[PDB]
């Protein structure tokens, strides 16, 4: 589990989004699997805006940060899991990294920010939805 919080914005897993998040819907991507909802209070996040290649990302399953070398967002085939058939998954970044089901939520973050949460991972592997390019969480 795990959310980003910027601005009025709570951007969440879409396969891990409440109740609450769908009444409160502001946007959302299968194909990226993520979900933003409207909050009522001011979120401290900063979205990171730049080109990084290397950061810092949470794993709930060792309570640890770990540094990681992750590729450019890409469109990557994903197996079919309890969430979603066996598909492409847009915007994906992946890493080397420990990851486990519930890992999925943890931020990753460089020099400038926020860059974007855990979705996929497995055999030594982890991936990160990037939302970098989602340019409107910085306003409205
Ligand atoms: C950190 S996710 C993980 C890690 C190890 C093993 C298995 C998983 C879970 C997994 O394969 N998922 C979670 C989410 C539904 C997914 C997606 N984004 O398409 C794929
Ligand atoms: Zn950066």
């Known amino acids: 589990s795990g959310a980003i919080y910027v ?7 879409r396969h891990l989004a409440t109740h609450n998040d769908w009444a409160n819907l502001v946007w959302e991507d299968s194909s990226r699997d993520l979900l933003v909802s409207s909050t009522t209070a001011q ?5 990171a805006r730049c080109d990084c290649q290397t ?10 940060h770990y540094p990681v070398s992750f590729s450019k967002p ?3 085939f994903v197996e079919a899991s309890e969430y979603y058939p066996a598909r492409y998954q847009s915007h994906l970044m992946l890493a080397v990294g420990h990851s486990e089901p519930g890992d999925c939520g943890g931020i990753l973050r460089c020099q400038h920010g926020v860059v974007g949460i855990v979705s ?15 340019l409107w969480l910085d306003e409205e």
Do not use: Q
């Not at 009025?8 to 897993?13: A, G, I, L």
């Not at 979120?43 to 979205?47: P, R, S």
């Not at 996929?120 to 970098?132: E, K, P, S, Y």
């Open 74 to 76: 890409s469109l990557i």
């Open 120 to 134: 996929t991972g497995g055999n030594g592997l982890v991936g990160f939805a990037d939302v970098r390019d989602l």
């Open 43 to 47: 979120g401290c996040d900063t979205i």
């Open 55 to 64: 950061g810092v990302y949470y794993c709930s399953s060792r309570r640890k």
């Open 7 to 13: 601005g009025n914005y709570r951007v969440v897993n």
